[PDB]
Design a protein around this ligand. Structure first.
Ligand SMILES: [Mg+2]
Ligand SMILES: [Mg+2]
Ligand SMILES: [Mg+2]
Ligand SMILES: [Mg+2]
Lengths: 339, 339, 339, 339
């Protein structure tokens, strides 16, 4: 029904990582062979799905856990460069159907900034997509978070290039996995652990002043915001009426509602619920919500049959389906972009 | 306006723990002197609040982190016994206004079962309230979860006594605190960390078959369900359409919506949002929602002015305000119970 | 997937009225030949639809405008008796699958009470369904409303038998049609005029004290309550804060929300909207909402595919789909009634 | 809290009509002496209210029933001209705080079009506000509707000037009053009759092709859309799936959702319900919703304390409170317009 939709939590993997791809698919797919074919394909199967379901344009990104799983910084940086080079070449086949997010090693802020700059300047990438914290340390058991002053040089690069950063989840690993998840392993991923990671990281950016030092920074969360809109009232209450009387205001200058109006976006990836969408329109606003799919972990059919048929006023179907993203990513014409 | 309300996430502390109380207050209270007085008081300040705001009956419970902070099992068990004996004596002063939940050391399933039984049979306590996992190990860095077969003896005691179990949060400690929370410490507690703990534990009970082995067991979550209602669609989708095709169905026989209809309850503690309440009525149903306050971390005025004045149909205001709890806790007569 | 659902705004017509049936189908059906077959059939097509869509029990009623279109009181009364005798015979073919509402001439309160009593006592009918006001006067241009003291004997009969009254719509006629609807005739029926009639009549019962004189009276409206839940706040405000300080309190002793908690029910007939259902759960409460179809003006497929697949908590799906009506109509077991 | 709000369903009356003002107040006010002073006051009481409640700009309109109550066309036209001349002079006192809608005699399309043009071109009025149908005929028992081709010249003037038309309610009179309302007179006005008139007229414009012949025409409804959003699903279903197979497609070329996205606006006048606002945000979209009060039938305190404190994302509070109206009415700066 609606044509020219934009999706932007849409993953690919390098052909040479088939064994890693099959392992991940053994956790999160019920048809691993199709999953492998679909996550590797760019220009045939993905285009067929999009043509069947009114998706004009997709911004592609590297699969989780991706480069954030790599704790050797030399190996991680080389892989990020190789991935960005590769997808830049694949999207040349269909530039009116595909863009790309930068894939980054996040071991070092300046290095990440320089690779993001190369991606935007050399290839016209639309932003960065990063799978939560960067694994680091001896067995990759440490975690690099980006909500501190060391990362100001990276966030300033984001706003100077004026591109958003998509904070995608990754799986729990090492000590955190063994202590919290190994004994309830079915909760790993979309059921719970993914949202716990992303919400921690983004609310860390909030409470550590990232959006105060970088008020134009745009951060995107999938899965209708990784629980955060559910607690909008409760977070705001415990910030404004409690923690900001105790020290939080020193590093957090606006309300959580301000940051959702000015800095934070949510997408519909993997959360095809009109009831939850309506609640998010109340708590976050339709201007800040973007359609997305989470392919190939989710199907085009599921996401698009939901969104195309959901009961929704026409103004917001148009905005969430494509017009919000057209403005955010400064998109020129693409297939059915005005249909 | 509505009288005879029942609240059941209402904390007290022992006078002799003032030093620990003042530390906890330094994290979660903006008026430490009033907090110390209010968390210790049972029969004067608490009654005055309840009289001003139409609260007929309160089921009291021990503050967090409580006994779950105590990793020496002998010390933890002695403190639980002391607390239960203490509160039983305190609530005899005003039995038409107060009941109590059992406070438990959860180091050993049979020990916890025996102390719950003593509380119910000797004192007429209404169930148990436990602050998430039990700290254990030589310096308290281990965590005891209850979503496994060792705890069958305990859960069968809950269903044999036919009393509910309230899974309350507690703070992150030790390794988990240092790795995830120390660099974003303003998120500890109500903003984020509390719900991450309780939702993990309760969904662990779901996916490890606790409610299949104990289909009559009632589990209560505060704070409108610790994010879980937001992801009801997404959890159900990733169970029924994904993980249940990969092995989860072998230890998880019903849908997440079944378990919320049959086993799980949520309360309004610390989440005084009509918009979110309405969304929870859609996702879990008004029959499964209980009024509560979270005093003295929240005020009677905030909780009761909100709920008394919220826009709500008369049927559900009556159920959520008192009639759901009257049925669940078999409370037929107390102050203003028929007002 | 839900089985054993109950539908209760489900119409039939006498075979001898083929022309009036075809005229009415010319306004409200896109397939007149199927409509004629379906509205006259009781025991084959209707059962086939129900078996395919998990409907265990249907309470049948006479099509609109039905007896309310007949302004000759002798002819009106004879037709009502004919219809009730007819449908009582028809449902004995499949008594486990069907009940019936009484069809009444509403020219005279005593006469209507006596025929309602005959239907319930002799045939075990479940209540009455009436298509808004009774046409009367020499050319049928008068309207008999039931919201006055003349009808106390009729409303007392409903409460004595403890059976509900379904206020179904009918078309505008005569002077009202000419002045308001003739020049915008596409609005006649479901788009607007139907709800305008029913809401006027039921809110007249409210404001003329019918539910004060008969506080056990149960009144059912289809189509999610004929606009009334949308204005629950506005009606309550203009009653309690305005009209009840100017004279309304003399004949209206409770609030509009009280009457929806105690007296008024709404059904999902012809309004297969989860968004509007959720709003109705907020403003009226799931305890007061009944599944229904509006067959054969709506299809089993539309109503049942919607309800079976709607995002809804399991508690309220069970209540709205059957358990509310099972209690309201004191039903014995029927096909799949506890499936 | 929010400053610079815009309200635009705000009524005044001429001092020389105090008798008629007091009669109207006897129906819809509980404090007649205050009502009389407030409905005639422009620059003192009205300004003090707005200063205390963060209202920067108000578009004023003549009270109901106003000129639509006058069935003598010479008398009606003279009064419209007098009222427009009067209010243009009155708003000169505080031009940064007030604008005005044109008041019109709607007996004749060209005459009304010419007076609207005079008001816009000579006085800078912002549009027209008309109280539903125009009384006409020998005793005023006829009604002039505007949903027909005779009114094309008027609607073309609206779009040529690019100003909106506010369809305000009026009381039922004459035969309609006697047949439908006299026996349930407490439903007259806000409880029911008002919405029945406006929804009929605007959905008449929809189904008689007014918005097809004049696709730039902007129509405003108060009271969150006079029931129409509640039935958006049902109207759309009975248009697209029923009536448009029987002839409606010949005079109605878009869906009802298209007309709410392109032509129709709703305001919050007299409907201070966050639950209903949230539902209207789903069904109509926050871009199409305007704050308003309905003063002095509603109080600034009721409307503004509600809206200032309602739980709502910051994006939509800004748009609904002022930014939607700033763009629709092409406003220059006014008090607190960018605060
Ligand atoms: Mg993804
Ligand atoms: Mg608590
Ligand atoms: Mg019907
Ligand atoms: Mg008004």
């Amino acid at each position: 029904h609606m044509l020219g939709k934009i999706a932007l939590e849409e993953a690919f993997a390098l052909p040479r990582f088939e064994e890693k791809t099959r392992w991940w698919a053994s956790l999160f797919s019920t048809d691993a062979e199709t999953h492998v074919k679909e996550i590797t394909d760019i220009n045939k199967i993905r285009i067929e799905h999009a043509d069947k379901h009114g998706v004009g344009y997709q911004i592609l990104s590297y699969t989780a856990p991706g480069v954030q799983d790599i704790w050797d910084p030399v190996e991680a940086q080389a892989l990020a460069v190789e991935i960005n080079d590769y997808i830049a070449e694949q999207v040349r086949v269909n530039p009116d159907r595909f863009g790309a997010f930068a894939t980054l090693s996040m071991h070092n802020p300046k290095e990440a900034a320089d690779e993001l700059r190369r991606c935007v300047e050399k290839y016209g990438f639309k932003g960065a997509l990063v799978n939560d914290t960067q694994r680091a340390g001896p067995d990759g058991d440490d975690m690099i978070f980006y909500d501190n002053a060391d990362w100001d040089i990276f966030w300033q690069t984001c706003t100077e290039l004026d591109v958003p950063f998509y904070m995608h989840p990754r799986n729990p690993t090492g000590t955190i996995y063994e202590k919290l998840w190994a004994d309830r392993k079915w909760l790993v991923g979309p059921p719970l652990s993914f949202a716990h990671g992303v919400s921690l990281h983004v609310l860390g950016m909030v409470t550590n002043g990232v959006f105060d030092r970088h008020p134009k920074l745009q951060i995107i969360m999938g899965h209708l915001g990784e629980h955060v809109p559910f607690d909008m009232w409760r977070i705001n209450h415990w910030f404004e009426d409690r923690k900001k009387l105790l020290g939080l205001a020193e590093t957090c200058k606006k309300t959580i509602r301000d940051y959702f109006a000015e800095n934070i976006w949510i997408t519909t990836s993997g959360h095809f619920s009109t009831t939850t969408l309506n609640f998010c329109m109340a708590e976050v606003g339709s201007d800040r919500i973007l359609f997305s799919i989470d392919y190939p972990y989710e199907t085009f059919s599921d996401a698009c049959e939901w969104f195309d048929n959901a009961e929704l006023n026409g103004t917001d179907r148009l905005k969430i389906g494509r017009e919000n993203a057209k403005k955010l990513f400064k998109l020129d014409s693409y297939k059915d972009s005005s249909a």
